[PDB]
Symmetry: D2
Amino acid sequence: QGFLPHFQHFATQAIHVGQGNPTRNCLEKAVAALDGAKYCLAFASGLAATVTITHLLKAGDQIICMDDVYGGTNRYFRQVASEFGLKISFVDCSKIKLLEAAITPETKLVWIETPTNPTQKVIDIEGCAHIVHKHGDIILVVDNTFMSPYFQRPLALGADISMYSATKYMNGHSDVVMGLVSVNCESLHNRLRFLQNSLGAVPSPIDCYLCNRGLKTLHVRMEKHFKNGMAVAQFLESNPWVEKVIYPGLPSHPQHELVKRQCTGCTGMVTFYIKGTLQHAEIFLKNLKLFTLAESLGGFESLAELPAIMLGISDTLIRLSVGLEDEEDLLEDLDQALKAAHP
Amino acid sequence: QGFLPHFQHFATQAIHVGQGNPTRNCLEKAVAALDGAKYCLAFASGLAATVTITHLLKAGDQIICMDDVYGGTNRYFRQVASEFGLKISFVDCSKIKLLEAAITPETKLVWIETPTNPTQKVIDIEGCAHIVHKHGDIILVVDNTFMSPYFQRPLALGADISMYSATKYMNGHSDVVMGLVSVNCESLHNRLRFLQNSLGAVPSPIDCYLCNRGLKTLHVRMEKHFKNGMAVAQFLESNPWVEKVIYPGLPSHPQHELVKRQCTGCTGMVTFYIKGTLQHAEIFLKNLKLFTLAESLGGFESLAELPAIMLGISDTLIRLSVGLEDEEDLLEDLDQALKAAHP
Amino acid sequence: QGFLPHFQHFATQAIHVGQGNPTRNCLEKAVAALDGAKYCLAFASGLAATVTITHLLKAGDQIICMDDVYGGTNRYFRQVASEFGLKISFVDCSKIKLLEAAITPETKLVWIETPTNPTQKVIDIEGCAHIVHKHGDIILVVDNTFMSPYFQRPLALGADISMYSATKYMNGHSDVVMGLVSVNCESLHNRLRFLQNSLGAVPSPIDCYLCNRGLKTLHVRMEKHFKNGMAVAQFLESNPWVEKVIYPGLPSHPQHELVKRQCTGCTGMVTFYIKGTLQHAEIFLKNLKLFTLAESLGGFESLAELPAIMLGISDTLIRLSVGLEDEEDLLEDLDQALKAAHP
Amino acid sequence: QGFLPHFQHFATQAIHVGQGNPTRNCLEKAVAALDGAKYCLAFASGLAATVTITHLLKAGDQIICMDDVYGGTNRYFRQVASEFGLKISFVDCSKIKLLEAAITPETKLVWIETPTNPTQKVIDIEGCAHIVHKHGDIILVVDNTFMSPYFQRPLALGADISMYSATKYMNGHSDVVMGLVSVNCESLHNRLRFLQNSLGAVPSPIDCYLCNRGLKTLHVRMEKHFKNGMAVAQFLESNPWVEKVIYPGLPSHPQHELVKRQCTGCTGMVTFYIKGTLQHAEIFLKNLKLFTLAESLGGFESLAELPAIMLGISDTLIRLSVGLEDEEDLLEDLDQALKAAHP
């Protein structure tokens, strides 16, 4: 039904394209294609990618970041801004109007992450692109990490840089770290390349090989994360013991319509509020038998978490990371622990 | 669809079960579950597993084999029977009545591969089960390599032994070789275990680790193989340059009914006859730009082969091992090649 | 001083030679060279190698094995002899005369291991070769595993088959299992090859690659095992708390002169008797702080063991597996625990 | 020999110590010990480590570098100083008096590589230590890449920071890249740690695992490099076709005395001038049959390079990166090539 039609040739390119030196170039060639980008640059980590992006700016320039309220980031950026001598301004871009405002004559970069973690507020990338590009020379960067190039393609939505940061967690707990920066601009790529080779925040031939190896199945893995995610999200929202569910894949989401015109699907990241108190989120989490209590997100295994203990996030909110297990089993495990949290 | 429903817990067991020593024991626990069996023993190669199974018999014993006409096998088995002094016999077990006639007092083992290669004749596991089990003490082994435990469960259909043999080709070109032998019978398992340890034809710890790792995405990869395989087979079947198609998933397959009540789905192996002459098949193969010419089967990559040059098999028969690329691109590559082979 | 001069080009060949299919062939090419053999065959395990060797014989033939009294083997061989229908005769070949005797008109194979485990009695390979080859068509097989092709080259000493069986323990605890069979004969190689490809007790491309990878440093690793072994062996034999030492590298060994004309050095396997009772071997072993209590042998780490609890072996005997640690530290750790075993 | 005695416990620590998370922390504990330092921080590449170290300084600060004339470096450093706005200066620190003159109020960092490449000029770590430390607050960093922590311990000789940067070339052609920064000073370590985590130029868990794994055989490999290196250098030095040799291990090296009181041994990098013309050097290189032509250094494989084509370096200067092959074969290959370059 509804989402942007999946990007053509993704799977074909992910498998055939290209099949630092050789290893890195091939990885980049292939990632460039999946991002619909003309160019790509690989870094040791998503963070190193981020730093390098900012090295693009000169002392004094202002950088406006999406405000990661409950999430972790923000301390970073702020530290990268401090050193290097830059001005950082965090603005909730959930409201396009707010971004229009914050734009200062010094603003040379706008960094956005969508969905957000763990509330999952979808930012209108296209909206921000037009607002940002409207005046002066400024860069729009989208951190596609939470969606992956398979479900979201920033560059196509007006972004100037689509950054993909993969941790030691997705292709199985495959300990491959990587910072992928894609772009179409000519100079942007040139400047970024120089930095890449000048500073050395680069990946090893092994990482590149492993990373590339894992991409081949990104499409089949992500589709299942989505089928399982959707299923879990529905079951929950229809469960008597769940106050609310937040999953970009459901129509109940406050941005479901923005989601269908920007993504081709959703991750296995499902958030939901459990009816009751922090004492109930407790019973629940402790009763899960198939889901695993972990603070990370991405494996083949379904993970659960209570951010409140892992004005603060409602201690009744739970973020799930639906993996590749059997949909039936996942639901039964959720059902069983919900019934336990309410005798 | 009207195939058996997908095996319960498969994905969950593949990802969670278990997570010559350790590594092998966990691989064995896992595969045992995927085959719906109490036990499983791993060997160096499917060929090794085969030889091991024939060691359950003693000189003077007889063994019936599904007669693999155009495939490669038969020379093996024969070389194995010659040595070890066993009596071997080949029967077109696709004709159950014909197996009956073959049963003999010294018959103690019946080896069955299905679907055949590359004609894809399907054998009724159940039938042969009733027939074989009916009289005397005799083992019914099913080589589940061409289906994978995901789409077929020999043990649940009567077979005594389900042997899954994987080559250096699936899970990408992961160079892991392995022979897995799942079983339920108590003494059958004990004899097999004694043989396993006393003869040393076992995998290395790394192979077991790698093999188990691939098991975790087997369901999603097989699903995509099945999808692309169904698309390819339908497309070729309604194409003006195709005489006929041989694909278990299509209702046009002679034993499509058997399939549905014996498998949960189908592999990416699509067989078809190109309209024309050996020369047209050649034009077709040379024109393919997305498919890769090769004699192996199973990678993420789509392959094409002309058995006549790699009585005899028709010079018009082409076997494709459909990969995990974009259905669209595969369809267009074939269409382009077929059109090219007909000006 | 004294031993046969090291085999020429070993290191060069181990690194350059060749730098189943490709992977296996290269591994075999290279191993053939290191064994000074014209040919080589790789199997899944040393045991699988052994079985395959015996498959060379026909029902009825007799196989004479070195008698592994305190060691583990013998149960194997005996089981392989049982099945397959062969006659096994275990004879202590420490006494060349004894082998001369046992030779039966049915004797078609003589299997020897030297040094022995854990007593380390050196067998005169050349002596047994002349005795064995003197009459009829019979095969002499030496299990070079305990020495490795770097310190001992059976084929050059008249052996017909030099078998090297590497476990998941040497190139670091590199979990690579492998059975290497080398030979110069034309037919022996032919028959063995057939068996190799007919039965499938073969290694995976990964194993072959890893195994080959590790060979490159075999010379430097083994030399240090020897320097450390020699040092440890001396310190011990000169220690007031040690009744006796048995290390082919010392002149005190009852075969030190046979050793210098058959090997180019020694392993890190040092055996020794601790002055006192099983209660003292206890105190000793329990006080080691750098050596590790393990029943295996081969890592980069120095291992200790008391075979009596790991007419039976004197419960006062200890086998060490000297690794690659600093010689000084190894001695100090031995010294410290010996002083503890005798307050 | 008259070199410093070999570092105590090195091999033992390399094999036992430790056996961004785990993997990296253990690599860091290990390398910290090998460098005889309290701490060590790992980065993506030696180049990344370098950039990180320069981040300890702020705009307006100055940094002195051993002037690498014929090597490659200098362009880096300069590109790093240009950006980040630092003042850089190059000094032939092999002439201690010349460094003194260079010290400035804004001087806060002195970078020293030794021996140089490919001339192999040796810098007195200690001297520069006394000189630099003498006045003001300034850091003395030593790039220990060309020696390895096995043959040189910068920190024990006065240096504040010892940076070991390994490429995809040693430990065989193990494609592991890494930059290790060992240190003793408390605040120096804390600032470095903050930078490490806040900027993300870190290794992946697999690189750390692989890197630590190679550390375990570093002593034995370096010893063989040193041996072969000594042999090669002596042989070339007494050969009729060699003008002169430049090898730290030979008493003919201008700073052979410094060496002995600063290193425990030498690398396999032997530099020498072929008697004759650029054309003779060419004949030599083309005739080599065992040595491999390459611009990298460090594998198990022996390499040869002619810097003049890969003021200016003499067209007669040849640098060899001596591997772990048989000394005999290396000597004969060189001799064969030299003879060939002189009819």
